[PDB]
Ligand binder design. Structure first.
Ligand SMILES: [Mg+2]
Ligand SMILES: [Mg+2]
Ligand SMILES: [Mg+2]
Ligand SMILES: [Mg+2]
Ligand SMILES: [Mg+2]
Ligand SMILES: [Mg+2]
Ligand SMILES: [Mg+2]
Ligand SMILES: [Mg+2]
Ligand SMILES: [Mg+2]
Ligand SMILES: [Mg+2]
Ligand SMILES: [Mg+2]
Ligand SMILES: [Mg+2]
Ligand SMILES: [Mg+2]
Ligand SMILES: [Mg+2]
Ligand SMILES: [Mg+2]
Ligand SMILES: [Mg+2]
Ligand SMILES: [Mg+2]
Ligand SMILES: [Mg+2]
Lengths: 200, 51, 186
RNA sequence: ACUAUGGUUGGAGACAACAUGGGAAUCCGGGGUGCUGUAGGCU
RNA sequence: GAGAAGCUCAGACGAGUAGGCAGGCGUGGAGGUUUGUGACGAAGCCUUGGGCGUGAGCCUGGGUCGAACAGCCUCUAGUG
RNA sequence: UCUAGUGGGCCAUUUUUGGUAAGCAGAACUGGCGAUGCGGGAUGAACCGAACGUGAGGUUAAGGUGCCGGAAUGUACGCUCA
RNA sequence: GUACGUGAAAUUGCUGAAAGGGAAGCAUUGGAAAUCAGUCUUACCUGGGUGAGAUCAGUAGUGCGAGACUAUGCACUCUGAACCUGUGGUAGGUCAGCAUCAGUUUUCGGGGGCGGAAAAAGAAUAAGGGAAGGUGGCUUUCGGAGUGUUUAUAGCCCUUGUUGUAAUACGUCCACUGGGGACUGAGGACUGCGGCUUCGUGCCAAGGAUGCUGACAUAAUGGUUUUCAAUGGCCCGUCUUGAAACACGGACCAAGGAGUCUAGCAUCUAUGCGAGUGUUUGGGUGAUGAAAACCCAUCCGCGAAAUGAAAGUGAAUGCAGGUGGGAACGCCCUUGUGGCGUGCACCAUCGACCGACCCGGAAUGGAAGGGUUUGAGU
């Protein structure tokens, strides 16, 4: 498990360096390096349970976003993207970095064990549930979520939807306009990480 | 078993129970030990300052 | 607030018999233990049926037992038949074969005819000793929907169920709405 | 153009702008002016 | 052992009219049981004292009083 | 499977029809009140926020922070005299 | 004390307590005053002082092997058994304070890695360009106003070199690190996962608080009552879309006061018996004591056959059939949500059989042959 963790660290660091080197090369030549689109998105429900129309209410149920300030990891594809478009006023989402993923799992990570919410306080709980997918530890689980590994569906579903607090420091003045309009709803790109720091 | 959740980010002993790699984890590696070239380019800077 | 919709929340099954029979309580005690300390679906089947009401535990006769255990491709030759319920007699079966049956109750006529044909009658606790996991046993049930009420359930236009009538004959619901010569048929 | 969704947006209102999405018609211009199956005939 | 009608570990959840179901509280009378309470004070009542229960209610000190009355398992109803 | 209550609704957003208009009448969609307390809109069934077991601590929504009143008689640039 | 057992409430007088600026009542929280409970450190264990005493462990003997018990003696005293004392120990409430931890959290720092135009600037320095002049100078006139030339005795702007791996800001990350504050301490022998170890039933911050002190103990903390202050609280019941309503009922208190019993029916449950079931129309022990219990015959009801208006007729081709799913069981795999074989219940489905009906169909009978049909059937 330690050896797997070390190789994951080297993998994250290697991918990050290559992104910097490719950007530097493009700037030098005067061309443009278009980075890879995100495969992972973190979604936080910002609206309570009142006054929700039927389609959005169903979509948030399918997203396991049943309570305000709940959070989930979602694999980003065309099917997921169109679902998030319908619930843009009711959620906010963006690209989480490595610190967000590992801290969500270390501090607020709970596993669905026999349909019960169990704290991830020992690597045995992870191995019992996801050992068939070669996931033996919390770092194995973090790596699977962050890199969207081939067993992302089983790993992400095993994680209970995160029960975040209200953000320390509050929200923006008006929560329920789009992030582009200076509100809090909808896609906010890497700013999802600053929001999670206040909520985790 | 498990009467009280302990945050591994605060309780170092719990962080050792999970993640055996934490002991050997080396943060803050220096990679700028070389001459540190500049990568801006002539075309990039003339595009940057237009208008 | 949480947005939880709850449909299958409370389990709909019996967790114990409604009966106050002390000996049924002793049988439940035996099969609570057996269903818990073995991996046998047979023992969990017996425990569940020990809870059931009378209408959910229909009787079975020795004719049906003899027929079910004597099929052409049976191999149910020398195996114990088990029913959580009453075993009745079928006087139409003039000659009873040799049968081994475990049951809650045996009718006096059923018990006498089983024994006279060289067979054997067991209670469910005797069965637990002989086959503690129900191995090489034929678990059987009587016909649940043979009771009168199922002639009537679902009565409605063109459902071909039996009406509730105080008497049978002409003048008792065989007129307008039951034939073409009287407005319409059903 | 229109439109799903959004705001304790603007405006007395009529409406309008903006935000996350979907997206015409018409006219005009260029190009084109039958293709093909079955069976059989034909300097 | 832990009234197996018991014991033990864990997780999620909690608006409610009309309405539905369950488990309880209290009252008159009946069977059973409790070497049950009682003129050395039953029942009832008052209380500027105490205790128990989420609650229906229950127990108790002091005062008043004078002939009966209660707990437990069941039965029952002109039962709040 | 058996059975109860119900078979007077009403408010808002948005699409509407009738009407001079209406705190008007009638329909469409969703959310609500009825059966919903709580923070806010001085007040208020329906508007905003949020839906509730008994409590401790923390943080928020909508909305606020001269005094009544918990919270800057805060910061920056203008406009305005009634 | 006959205005007589008990002697409630409404309502009233006296006494006491308390409060009171156009209602009162209630809720939350504390103050004040009044009032209530701790009876602690009892039990059990050991030690210390003296005291007296039928004296205790192994044994001898009285159901064969092992174990418990009583009983006759011995063991005759550093042992064992009862009793006396000490303001004996662990002291026991109430409340504080600090420390070391754990859980949650808030607030303030320090160090470092990386990123970007490998920031933009900037400083000092070497090579350039330029126009506004400090106007250096020129000049109305020895007392200052206007010119008209690109560094003078000033300065500025725009380009490139290094000393560059410049700094700094910002962004991001550190399983880097240092403090301050608050709330909580659920659980109760052990067991786990980790770490550290002198490798051991050792140590730790690692499956939830301990340690160290002190003061009080007609105090304190809790409880109760009244009242005050601050904040909130409209009058209940009802019909209603909607009641605080200028909608109706309600001055007050006691006692009474409304889903019952019966003939049925339906579902569900329990009990007995089961192809049957039902002793209470009756009759008997029966007279003693008998509205009960208990016993006993023939009928009869419902069920064991349907269908048809009726006259009538009346249920197996077959393992009482075939197909699909399927409980339970058995066998094979090989670790899968397996494959294989029987197949209860139930549902869907293709047939067969009985009655009705519609057919042809070789005086009375309707046998074989049929049918898209029909029945509360088999
Ligand atoms: Mg704050
Ligand atoms: Mg706000
Ligand atoms: Mg719009
Ligand atoms: Mg809105
Ligand atoms: Mg409720
Ligand atoms: Mg009475
Ligand atoms: Mg008395
Ligand atoms: Mg009083
Ligand atoms: Mg209590
Ligand atoms: Mg009554
Ligand atoms: Mg203030
Ligand atoms: Mg008020
Ligand atoms: Mg109503
Ligand atoms: Mg009212
Ligand atoms: Mg009225
Ligand atoms: Mg009226
Ligand atoms: Mg009146
Ligand atoms: Mg009364």
């Amino acid at each position: 498990i330690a050896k797997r963790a070390e190789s994951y660290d080297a993998e994250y660091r290697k991918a990050e360096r290559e992104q910097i080197e490719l950007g530097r090369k493009a700037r030098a030549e005067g061309n443009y390096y278009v980075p890879d689109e995100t495969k992972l998105v973190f979604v936080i429900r910002i609206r309570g349970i009142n006054n929700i129309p039927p389609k959005a209410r169903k979509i948030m149920q399918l997203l396991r976003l049943i309570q305000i300030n709940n959070g989930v990891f979602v694999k980003f594809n065309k099917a997921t993207k169109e679902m998030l478009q319908v619930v843009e006023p009711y959620v906010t989402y963006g690209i989480p970095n490595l610190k967000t993923v590992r801290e969500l799992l270390y501090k607020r990570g709970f596993g669905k064990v026999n349909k019960q919410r169990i704290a991830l306080s020992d690597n045995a709980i992870i191995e019992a549930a996801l050992g068939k997918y070669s996931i033996l530890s919390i770092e194995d689980l973090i790596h699977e979520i962050y890199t969207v590994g081939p067993n992302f569906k089983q790993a992400a579903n095993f994680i209970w939807p995160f029960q975040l607090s209200s953000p320390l420091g509050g929200w923006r003045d008006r929560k329920f306009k789009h992030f582009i309009e200076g509100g809090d709803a909808g896609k906010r790109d890497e700013h999802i990480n600053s929001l999670v720091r206040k909520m985790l | 078993a498990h009467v009280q959740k302990k945050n591994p980010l605060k309780n170092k002993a719990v962080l050792a129970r999970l993640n055996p790699y934490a002991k050997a984890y080396k943060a803050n590696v220096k990679l700028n030990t070389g001459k540190t070239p500049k990568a801006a380019g002539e075309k990039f800077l003339t595009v940057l300052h237009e208008n | 607030g949480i947005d939880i919709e709850r449909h299958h929340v409370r389990k709909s099954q019996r967790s114990k018999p409604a009966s106050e029979n002390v000996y049924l309580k002793l049988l439940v005690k035996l099969y609570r233990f057996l269903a818990r300390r073995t991996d046998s679906r047979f023992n969990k089947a017996i425990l569940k049926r020990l809870f059931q009401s009378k209408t959910n535990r229909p009787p079975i006769s020795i004719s049906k037992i003899a027929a079910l255990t004597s099929r052409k491709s049976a191999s149910l030759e020398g195996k114990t038949t088990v029913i959580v319920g009453t075993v009745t007699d079928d006087e139409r079966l003039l000659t009873v074969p040799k049968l081994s049956v475990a049951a809650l109750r045996f009718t006096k006529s059923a018990r006498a005819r089983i024994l006279k044909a060289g067979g054997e009658v067991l209670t469910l606790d005797q069965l637990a000793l002989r086959a503690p996991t129900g191995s090489n046993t034929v678990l059987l049930r009587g016909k649940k929907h043979a009771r009168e009420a199922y002639r009537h359930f679902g009565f409605g236009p063109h459902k071909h169920k039996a009406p509730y009538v105080r008497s049978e004959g002409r003048k008792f619901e065989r007129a307008r709405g039951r034939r073409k010569s009287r407005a319409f048929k059903v």
